[PDB]
Amino acid sequence: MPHAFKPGDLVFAKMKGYPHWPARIDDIADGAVKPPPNKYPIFFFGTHETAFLGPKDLFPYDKSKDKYGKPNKRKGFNEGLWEIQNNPHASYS
Numbered sequence: 001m002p003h004a005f006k007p008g009d010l011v012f013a014k015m016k017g018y019p020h021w022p023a024r025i026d027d028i029a030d031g032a033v034k035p036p037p038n039k040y041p042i043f044f045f046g047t048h049e050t051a052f053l054g055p056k057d058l059f060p061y062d063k064s065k066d067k068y069g070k071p072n073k074r075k076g077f078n079e080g081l082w083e084i085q086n087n088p089h090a091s092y093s
């Protein structure tokens with residue numbers, strides 16, 4: 001059975017106006033800004049941007065990739081497909 005989201009989990013994450021985007025649940029570093037309650041820090045592959053999202057916008061990657069893991073014309077997307085499949089736990093700082 002599913003657990004709650006934890007850092008390291010791979011997802012597609014949905015933001016208004018954008019396709020379901022390859023992403024991971026990030027850790028929060030010591031001393032860094034925390035997310036709002038009930039939100040997770042989401043690191044978007046390809047763009048390398050972070051936003052705070054709740055579970056309603058988080059689709060586990062294994063279950064969802066057949067539907068959402070297709071090339072897109074949006075900036076950063078196809079790089080991000082490569083990252084989530086090939087090195088999803090790397091440092092992209």
Ligand SMILES: O=C(COc1ccc(F)cc1)N1CCCC1
Binds near residue numbers: 021049050
């Ligand atoms: O909206 C976001 C991430 O959120 C931020 C965007 C810009 C920024 F400077 C900081 C955060 N994304 C939509 C799908 C790819 C990444």
